Amino acid sequence: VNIVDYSDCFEGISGGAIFCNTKNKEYNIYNKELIETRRSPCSTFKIVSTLIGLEKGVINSKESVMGYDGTDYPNKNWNKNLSLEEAFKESCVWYYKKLINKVDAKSVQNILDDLKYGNCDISEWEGDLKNGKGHLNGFWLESSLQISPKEQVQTMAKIFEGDTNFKKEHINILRDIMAIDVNDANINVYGKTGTGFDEKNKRVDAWFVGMLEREGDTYYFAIKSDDSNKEITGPKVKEIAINIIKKYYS
């Protein structure tokens, strides 16, 4: 466990980072207090909810559809019968809500328990209804389920090192749809952003969680901001994460 200073890449934004290489067990941690604090995963939960849907047969491939019903949404790309790959990349809320609501709560509870997914608290299945957004809510979106960045990395490692019971075919679907382009062919980066606002503490929950492969070595990582500035989003923290990867992990 090495405590590190990535503050220059955070460019004044409050947050922390954790990178873990499980081959040689090198844990690099910036802002240890934050990295151990549990928070809502927000859209980073799509990593796990995709695998749940595949395991239960609700979806089957990166082409799989969820039966769009014509409801009007402000995001153009949500207004179509999109595939799993597109719903993941466009963070289509209705697709992932419909997917998870086809799965019984005990199945979800047991999978989260097996993954040690934070507090594994799905008690508020419906999510944070007081924000007025109705069915565009769920237990993983600023609601009962909370996970620390360190726990995110531990879960990512267990999934992608093949240490869970999820099918390899399903892991590979997730890998494909998580891959991102960082304009450096010499590293393979995979990840997912998340964005929420913590109304109790007046702070954002801005996430980028994923993994990095660079010549035999793999790092699992979670970058997280808790800034009070509402302008700080998941996509912004992904930029920060990319800067760290290029500076220290290339």
Ligand SMILES: *C(=O)N1C[C@H](NOS(=O)(=O)O)CC[C@H]1C(N)=O
């Ligand atoms: C996930 O955190 N969400 C879904 C969507 N995309 O977020 S992302 O750009 O950080 O991946 C909008 C924000 C958030 C939500 N409000 O549900």
